[PDB]
Amino acid sequence: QCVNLITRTQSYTNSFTRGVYYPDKVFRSSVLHSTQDLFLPFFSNVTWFHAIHVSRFDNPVLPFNDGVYFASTEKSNIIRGWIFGTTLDSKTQSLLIVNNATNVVIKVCEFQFCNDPFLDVYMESEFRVYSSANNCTFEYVSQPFLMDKNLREFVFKNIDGYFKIYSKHTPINLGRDLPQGFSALEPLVDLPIGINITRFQTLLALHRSYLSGWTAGAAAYYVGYLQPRTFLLKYNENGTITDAVDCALDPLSETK
Amino acid sequence: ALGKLQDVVNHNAQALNTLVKQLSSKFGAISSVLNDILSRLDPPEAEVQIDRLITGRLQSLQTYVTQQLIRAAEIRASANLAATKMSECVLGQSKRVD
Amino acid sequence: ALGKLQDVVNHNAQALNTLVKQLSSKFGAISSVLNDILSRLDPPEAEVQIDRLITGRLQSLQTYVTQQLIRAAEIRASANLAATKMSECVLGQSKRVD
Amino acid sequence: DLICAQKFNGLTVLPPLLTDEMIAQYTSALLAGTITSGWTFGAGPA
Amino acid sequence: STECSNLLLQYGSFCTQLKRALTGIAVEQDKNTQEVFAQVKQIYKTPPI
Amino acid sequence: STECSNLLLQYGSFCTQLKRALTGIAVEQDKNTQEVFAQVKQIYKTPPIKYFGGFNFSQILPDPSKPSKRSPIEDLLFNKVT
Amino acid sequence: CTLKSFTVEKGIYQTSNFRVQPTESIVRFPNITNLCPFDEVFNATRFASVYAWNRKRISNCVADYSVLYNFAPFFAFKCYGVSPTKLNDLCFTNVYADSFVIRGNEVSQIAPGQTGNIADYNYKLPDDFTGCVIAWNSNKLDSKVGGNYNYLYRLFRKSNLKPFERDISTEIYQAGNKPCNGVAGFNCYFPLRSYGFRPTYGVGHQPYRVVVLSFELLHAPATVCGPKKSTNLVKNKCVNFNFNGLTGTGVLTESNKKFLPFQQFGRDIADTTDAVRDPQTLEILDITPCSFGGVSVITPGTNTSNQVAVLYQGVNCTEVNVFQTRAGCLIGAEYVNNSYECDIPIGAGICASYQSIIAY
Amino acid sequence: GTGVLTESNKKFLPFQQFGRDIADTTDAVRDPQTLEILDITPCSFGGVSVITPGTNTSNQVAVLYQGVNCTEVNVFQTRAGCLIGAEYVNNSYECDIPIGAGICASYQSIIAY
Ligand SMILES: *[C@@H]1O[C@H](CO)[C@@H](O[C@@H]2O[C@H](CO)[C@@H](O)[C@H](O)[C@H]2NC(C)=O)[C@H](O)[C@H]1NC(C)=O
Ligand SMILES: *[C@@H]1O[C@H](CO)[C@@H](O[C@@H]2O[C@H](CO)[C@@H](O)[C@H](O)[C@H]2NC(C)=O)[C@H](O)[C@H]1NC(C)=O
Ligand SMILES: *[C@@H]1O[C@H](CO)[C@@H](O)[C@H](O)[C@H]1NC(C)=O
Ligand SMILES: *[C@@H]1O[C@H](CO)[C@@H](O)[C@H](O)[C@H]1NC(C)=O
Ligand SMILES: *[C@@H]1O[C@H](CO)[C@@H](O)[C@H](O)[C@H]1NC(C)=O
Ligand SMILES: *[C@@H]1O[C@H](CO)[C@@H](O)[C@H](O)[C@H]1NC(C)=O
Ligand SMILES: *[C@@H]1O[C@H](CO)[C@@H](O)[C@H](O)[C@H]1NC(C)=O
Ligand SMILES: *[C@@H]1O[C@H](CO)[C@@H](O)[C@H](O)[C@H]1NC(C)=O
Ligand SMILES: *[C@@H]1O[C@H](CO)[C@@H](O)[C@H](O)[C@H]1NC(C)=O
């Protein structure tokens, strides 16, 4: 039941100082800590994707590279999760993250993914996400991380068997979607997956029309790519990362 | 105005901080924590790892003592100059120019 | 007549030359070249050989910096004396004997 | 070639802040002050 | 050599200490020259005769 | 760690050398302070009437109001060095 | 003893460092106890081939390694980053069991930094590997008289594998200048070849079952722990504690540091452990080093007297003729209001003399 | 190794293959394929120094590549090295930030004089 419904346009914006996360699970207070990790570089080129369904294949699969910074200003019901893998068919393993109103299901199987996968509500069906799922080797159900203007930021890394997801939810006063300042993302889950991830895709939810089988919808999201970079993070009195300098961005920050 | 004295304070704290920072160096060993090395290895190989940590920390401590001695010599020269100024400028009138 | 300044130049160049010559010291390793050690040995063995070269070269660099600091202290004392002679012999007439 | 070897090994000579010409100029100023003004220039106006 | 630098990072801030000491010596030499020669703030010149 | 100390004993009198050098520096600093400041064996005091023919030394003489008994200049110096 | 002389001159001498010793050892481990499925890995009838080696994740169990020792036909039991006897006392995460079958002579190649065929194209170990390799002969089960050809290895590959990478692609290899186009022929060979395992052969060629246990050390929350029992927690006392394999000597106190839910350990400016979050009870215990200081022995000459006083540097008098000074706590000297010249320097304006030993 | 291979004026004897400096560092080599002498000279390196005023005042910076000619890297050539990001001014002022070889830098933009 794979149907091509989503068309996608893309623009380029500035990352500013978004994308900082806690590099480990160690509490540090009122210190300057220099760490080398996969970070989103400051003022880097981030692609803004607008995915539109109106009531042919124009929704290609994005690369994963060394890790992905994901952001969205949309509500929690439009963007419902992600797809990770290499071939996205029955010959290789793949990771499916699906959120709904009650919980999140993270599941690694041999999914035969559709070219334009989307979760359709009518109850929720995954027959437009994939056509088959066999030899399934991982399942993890937990509390959702898409809950209810509000900018939602995620960092995905695939390091030595673990898919690390970092998340932050920030109330952004009406203005530029990617705001200034620092909002450090916190580690949300480390999943012992151990699969090869080179490509990824965002999952959207579409409503049936009952009148043009699916309701028309739009979703805007920002994707940036992490690079191996050395950061100097400032930990305040309460352990929060309130500031950072990217060591290789400019000579002033390199001096810092 | 008071840059010189603060500089001396700045050097001393930094030297101690560097010496403190040197405790976080593996020095070619599996870990920088001695308790982990004891808790994880048998004495034939733990002795080797502790030896690597001991030689690295001892080299750091000798380096710190060497710079402390050099700075002590510089401060002693400055103090001797200060004592000479106290004797000749405060306790008398000096005809030495500048 | 001008041996002292020439001596300073002679010491500095020789110290740099000695530091350069320290790069051609095996320090107990199979070779003084990192490339040859890396190509001709397996990673754990090469790691050990390189770490021997690293500790030997680091000891040489610390020795050079320490002797440079001591010579810097000597030159600083000589410069302070030269400044005192500049102030008291050139900018005024000195009643200090010799 | 002696300087070249040091440069190849990462040892760099830093130039003196005061060049030989400016140090010579300072000595010239001191000589002119001590010849034309005696010790007055060292203690105040020349 | 990248491998040598990776092994060198295990020794910590020895490189920082050596660079800082040499930087202190380098600024000290300029300060020494400034103390010895720059004792006047007026550049005097001799008369033409 | 006792085992670390046992292995450290094989290196000899390095620890004694470092402690002796630091102790020498520590006594040297006190000797430096004695040489600079303790050059008079009489503690002189100013007269209660601070009139010196028009010369004002309030900024350098000790302030009775302050608990530290320091001069205004000395108090400023202590505040400005941290 | 410190001065190596039987006569001590008048003065203050630094002799040793006073430190309060721990009173009891507390071990805190997760309360959860589940028998770990080592039977599945070690007692299985069939193992995978070296090109398609089986990886099993071990997590959320308590492991008793003593039974591994109790029953063991394992000719080789070699550990690299950890002691075999200390495994019961440590906590781990990232535990993996890698099972495969290789030759008798190939057991040396399952090591970090080894050059070989199965090392490069079948199973690669990292240089920083920690864990234990287990090898035992399997002639009785993994061999047949007619030849057991079920175990295959990758003889040919374009490039070396990564650590913990499995290659099961049955694509042809081009061994020469001429392209092969997916068809075997001259200079075109299949990459996977089977072992000729027969019981009649001598040692060195018999099939060997190898299981590699891989761990990580302390850099994540641990889920696999040893059989050690959890003890109760004690506050405000010098104890030697063991939190999830982290051993330290300090006083555990209540903390006001707002730890985030993921955060476990705590660190100071020196990146040394300053707080811990216990797995069994999710509370934050601040770790403070036990009281210590330098002891200086103030004494006059042995010609004059044998009385001594001790100065504990930087230590308040309530944590050890008792006088409190800025330098530290002075025991054995009586403070005298009367001011005299300095005889034995103590510090912070305080000097000592012999008249009994007085401090002023 | 790694280095530039320039033409050499050194006349090697027929048995010699490599060449060394006074300080025992390789300075020459003979090519095996064609019997010619090349002066192995390592690739350019420099000490990157950052000249900046206080962050309280401004965020403008200048970069000094010590020992590097400006053609091998607001670009000015000094005897200390190549200074990028500061504009040379023919006026003379007191030294604020020392650069070297008589060059000093100040903030007014960042000027070098
Ligand atoms: C949201 O997702 C959860 C998890 O996939 C759904 O809960 C499951 O529903 C199925 C219905 O066939 C049950 O068999 C499972 O036992 C449920 N699992 C859990 C953990 O509750 C839930 O139904 C979804 N909600 C909607 C509205 O689709
Ligand atoms: C000496 O100098 C002090 C301060 O330099 C003078 O004290 C000042 O007195 C004036 C007028 O009485 C006040 O307005 C100031 O506030 C005072 N300053 C301070 C710091 O106290 C003092 O009057 C001078 N003369 C004598 C005789 O002491
Ligand atoms: C981002 O990339 C696109 C194409 O790679 C380019 O056209 C655009 O100028 C870039 N944006 C910025 C801010 O550099
Ligand atoms: C991951 O998959 C891509 C494409 O399928 C492949 O080129 C790459 O070599 C794979 N990497 C690993 C480590 O398997
Ligand atoms: C994958 O599934 C197919 C059919 O569902 C099966 O033939 C194959 O053996 C499975 N592979 C594994 C590793 O389970
Ligand atoms: C830190 O925590 C305290 C106490 O919860 C709170 O009052 C304060 O606002 C927090 N933030 C900062 C920056 O101090
Ligand atoms: C191991 O397996 C054998 C046969 O496969 C069985 O007889 C034995 O009881 C098993 N032992 C354990 C401890 O499971
Ligand atoms: C046991 O530990 C778990 C954490 O792994 C915790 O959630 C639980 O409350 C603990 N149980 C008891 C009785 O302390
Ligand atoms: C080696 O081959 C080159 C290329 O044909 C030729 O010029 C040269 O004469 C040959 N012999 C030697 C000794 O280099």
H84-107 burial code (b ≥16 CB/10 A, e <16): bbbeeeeeeeebebbbbbbbbbbb
Residues C20, D34: C-beta atoms closer than 8 Å? no
**Cβ A47 vs Cβ A224: under 8 Å:** yes
Give CA–CA dist F65/F75, Å, rounded: 12
Q: Give the side-chain half-sphere CA count within 13 A for G117.
A: 13
In whole angstroms, give the CA distance from residue H48 to residue E13.
Answer: 19
For residue A10 and ligand 3, the question of a CB distance below 6 A is answered with no
With beta carbons less than 8 A apart as the criterion, state whether B25 and E14 touch. Answer: no
CA H48 to chain centre: 10
Half-sphere exposure of H87 (CA within 13 A, CB side): 7
> Closest Cα of chain E to B24: distance in Å?
8
Q: How far is the CA of H34 from the centre of ligand 9 (A)?
A: 6
Rounded to a whole number of angstroms, the CA Rg of chain H reads 21
For ligand 3, the distance from its centroid to the CA atom of residue A46, given in whole angstroms, is 9
DSSP character string of A21-65: B-SSS-EE-SEEEEEEEEEPPTT-EEEEEEEEE----B-PPEE-T
What are the backbone dihedrals phi and psi of residue A244, each rounded to the nearest 5 degrees, phi first? Answer: -155, 155
Q: Find which of G128, G223, G262, G265 to mutate to test the A interface (most A CBs within 10 Å of its CB).
A: G262
Return d(Cα G116, Cα G143) in angstroms, integer: 24
Distance, CA of D42 to CA of C87 (rounded, Å): 8
- Set of chain D residues whose Cβ sits within 8 Å of the Cβ of B97: 39, 42-43
Residues in chain C: 98
Q: Is C58 exposed, middle or buried (0-12, 13-18, 19+ CB in 10 A)?
A: middle
**Strand pairing report for G344-347 and G350-354:** antiparallel
Which candidate in H50, H63, H82 is best for mutational testing of the A interface (most A CBs within 10 A)? H50
Please, what's the largest Cα pairwise distance for chain A?
63
Query: What are chain G's partners, defined as 3 or more CB pairs within 8 angstroms?
Result: A, B, C, F
Q: Is the CB of A105 under 6 A from ligand 1?
A: yes
**Three-point CA angle H30, H33, H37, nearest 5°:** 25
Q: Does the distance separating the beta carbons of E12 and B63 come in below 8 Å?
A: no
Burial class (CB in 10 A: 0-12, 13-18, 19+), G277: buried
Experimental determination technique: cryo-EM
Q: Is A28 within 8 Å of G267 when comparing Cβ atoms?
A: yes
Distance CA G297, CA G310 (A): 5
Given the structure tokens 């000097």, which residue do they identify?
G351
Instruction: Report how far residue F26's alpha carbon sits from residue B5's, in angstroms, rounded to the nearest whole number.
Output: 18
Q: F38's torsion region: left (phi>0), alpha (psi -120 to 50) or beta?
A: beta
Cβ atoms of residues A70 and A153 within 8 Å: yes
The tally of CA atoms less than 13 A away on the side-chain side of residue G57 is: 13
Q: A237 near A229, Cβ under 8 Å?
A: no
| Gap between the Cα atoms of A139 and A193, Å rounded | 10
In degrees and rounded to multiples of 5, residue G88 shows phi and psi of: -75, -15
Q: Which of G46, G70, G59, G219 is nearest to G138 (CA)?
A: G46
Quick one: E44 exposed, middle or buried, by C-beta within 10 A (0-12, 13-18, 19+)? middle
User: Of 2.60.120.960, 3.20.20.300, 3.40.50.720, 2.60.40.10, which CATH number belongs to A7-256?
Assistant: 2.60.120.960
Do the two chains C and E touch, given a threshold of 8 Å on CB pairs and at least 3 pairs?
Answer: yes
Residue nearest to atom 14 of ligand 3 (CA): A45
3-state secondary structure chain G: CCCCCCCCCCEEEEEEEEECCCCCEEEECCCCCCECCHHHHHCCCCCCECCCCEEEEECCEECCCHHHHHCCCCCEEEECCCCCCCHHHCEEEEEEEEEEEECCHHHHHCCCCCCCHHHHHCCCCCCCCCEEEEEEECCCCCCCCCCECCCEEECCCCCCCCCCCCCCCCCCEECCCCCCCCCCECCEECCEEECCECCCCCCCCCCEEEEEEEEECCCCCCCEECCCCCCCCCCCCEEEEEECCEEEEEEEEECCCCCCCCCCCEECCCCCEEEEECCCCCCEEEEECCCEEEEEEEECCCCCCCCCEEEEECCCHHHCCEEECCCEEEECCEECCCCCCCCEEEECCEEEEECCEEEC
Spatial CB neighbours of G9, under 8 Å, sequence gap ≥ 6: G301
d(CA B44, CA B36) in angstroms, rounded, equals 15
Residue B95 has φ and ψ, to the nearest 5°, of -95, 0
Tokens 């081939």 appear where?
G49
Q: Where are the beta strands (DSSP E) in chain A?
A: 7-14, 27-28, 31-39, 45-53, 62-63, 68-72, 79-85, 94-99, 104-113, 118-121, 124-125, 130-142, 150-159, 162-171, 186-192, 199-207, 217-225, 227-235, 241-246
- Both tokens assigned to A246: 């990217």
Whether G86 lines ligand 4, by a CB cut-off of 6 Å, is no
Residue type, G63: A
Could you tell me the CA-to-CA distances from G184 to G158, G172, G175, G250 in Å, in that order? Answer: 17, 8, 11, 69
Instruction: Count CB atoms within 10 A of the CB of residue F79.
Output: 9
Contacts of G92 (CB under 8 A, 6+ apart): G215, G216, G217, G222, G223, G224, G225, G245
Rounded CA-CA distance H113/H97 in Å is 10
Cα A246 to the chain's mean position, in Å?
22
Per-residue CA distances from A94 to A126, A136, A163, F14, G57 (Å): 15, 9, 12, 60, 18
CB atoms within 10 A of CB A2: 14
What is the CA(G264)–ligand 8 centre distance, in A? 15
Residue given tokens 């395992």 in the structure block: G197
Residue H24: which region, alpha, beta or left (left: phi > 0; alpha: psi -120 to 50)?
A: left
Named by the residue before each, gaps in chain H exceeding 2.5 A from C to N are 73, 108
Say if residues D36 and E47 touch (Cβ distance below 8 Å).
Answer: yes
Residues in contact with G118: Cβ distance below 8 Å, sequence separation at least 6, in sequence order: G50, G102, G106, G109, G110, G153, G154
Q: Ligand 7 centre from G207 Cα, in Å?
A: 20
User: How many Å lie between the alpha carbon of B30 and the closest alpha carbon of chain E?
Assistant: 10
Q: Does the C-beta of G39 come closer than 6 Å to ligand 7?
A: yes
Match 């350019």 to its residue by tokens: H44
- One-letter amino acid identity for C29? A
List all residues 6 or more positions away from E45 whose beta carbon is below 8 Å from its beta carbon: D28, D29, D32
Minimal-distance CA residue to ligand 5 atom 13: A135
Task: Extract the tokens encoding G42.
Answer: 């070690």
Q: How many CB atoms lie within 10 A of CB A21?
A: 27
- Whether residue A211 contacts residue A126, with contact meaning beta carbons closer than 8 Å, is answered with no
- The three-class DSSP label of residue A248 is coil
- Among G93, G264, G280, which is best to mutate for testing ligand 8, by the most ligand atoms less than 8 A from CB? G280
Three-class secondary structure of residue A246 per DSSP: strand
Q: For residue G106, how many other CB atoms are within 10 A of its CB? A: 24
CB A166 within 8 Å of CB A190: no
Give how far Cα G316 sits from Cα of A98, G199, G312, G333, G358, Å.
60, 76, 8, 16, 19
A188 burial (CB, 10 Å; 0-12 / 13-18 / 19+) is middle
Is the Cβ atom of H33 under 6 angstroms away from ligand 9?
A: yes
Structure tokens at G311: 């100065």
Tell me if A99 sits within 8 A of A80, measured CB to CB: yes
Q: Quick check: do H and C touch, 3+ CB pairs under 8 A?
A: yes
Range list of H helices, chain A: 251-255
Distance CA H46, CA G305 (A): 67
Determine the residue type at H54: G
Using the Cα atoms of residue G325, residue G327, residue G332 and residue G337 in order, give the sign of their dihedral.
negative
Resolution limit, Å = 3.0
Q: Which of E45, D39, E39, D26 is nearest to C91 (CA)?
A: D39
Distance CA A135, CA C48 (A): 45
**Residue C89 DSSP one-character state:** I
Q: A45: Cβ below 6 Å to ligand 3?
A: yes
Which amino acid makes up residue B9? Answer: V
Helix-strand-coil percent breakdown of chain B, rounded to 5?
Answer: 80, 0, 20
- Amino acid letter at B98? D
- Specify the amino acid at residue B81: L
Q: How far is CA A24 from the centre of its chain?
A: 19
DSSP annotation string for A104-116: EEEEEEEEEE-SS
Neighbours of B34 (CB within 10 A): 19
**How many angstroms from the chain centroid is the CA of residue A85?**
14
Helix (H) or strand (E) holding C7: helix C3-21
| Minimum CA–CA partner of B23 in chain E | E12
Is residue A61 within 8 Å of residue A88, measured between CB atoms? yes
Handedness of CA F70, F73, F79, F82 (dihedral sign): negative
Provide the angle, in degrees to the nearest 10, between the axes of the packed helices B43-85 and C43-85. 10
Which one, of A172, A121, A163, A173, lies nearest residue A140 by Cα? A163
> What are the residues facing G14 on neighbouring strands?
G296
**SS3 assignment, position A13:** strand
Residue F43 near residue B87 (C-beta atoms within 8 A):
no
Q: Which two tokens mark H78?
A: 């000094």
DSSP state of F43: -
In one-letter notation, the amino acid at residue C7 is D
Which DSSP letter does residue B53 get? Answer: H
**Collapsed DSSP state (helix, strand, coil) of residue B17:** helix
- Is the four-CA dihedral A205, A210, A211, A213 of positive or negative sign? positive
Q: Count Cα atoms within 13 angstroms, Cβ side, for A66.
A: 10
> By alpha-carbon position, which residue is closest to atom 6 of ligand 3?
A12
At which residue do the structure tokens 């994005």 appear? A62
| C66 in contact with chain B, both atoms CB, cutoff 8 A | yes
State how beta strands G61-62 and G224-225 pair: parallel
- Distance of alpha carbon A166 from alpha carbon A22, whole angstroms: 8
The number of CA neighbours under 13 Å toward the Cβ of A245 is 13
Residues in chain D: 46
Show the ligand 6 pocket: residues with CB < 6 angstroms: A 236-238
Q: C-alpha F64: how far from its chain's center? A: 22
Q: Taking Cα atoms as reference points, which of G150, G192, G155 lies closest to residue G170?
A: G192
Rounded Cα–Cα distance for residues G122 and G289 (Å):
49
- DSSP code at position B88: I
The DSSP bridge partners found for residue G310 are G297, G331
| Contacts of residue D7, Cβ cutoff 8 Å, sequence gap at least 6 | H45, H67
- Within 13 Å and on the Cβ side, how many CA atoms surround G180? 16
For residue G39, give the ligand 7 atom closest to its CA: 14
Chains F and C touch (3+ CB pairs under 8 A): no
In chain B, residues with a C-beta closer than 8 Å to the C-beta of C91 are 97-98
What residue ranges in chain E does DSSP mark as E strands? none
* DSSP type of residue C92: S
A234, A247, A249, A252: which to substitute to probe chain H, counting the most H Cβ within 10 Å? A252
Record the tokens describing residue H81, joined without a space.
């090295």
Helix (H, G, I), strand (E, B) or coil at H75: strand
* H or E segment and range at residue H99: strand H97-100
Tell me the two tokens of residue A210. 């009952």
| Nearest CA, atom 14, ligand 6 | A237
User: Which chain A residues are closer than 8 Å to H52 by Cβ?
Assistant: 251-252, 255
Domain limits, chain A:
7-256
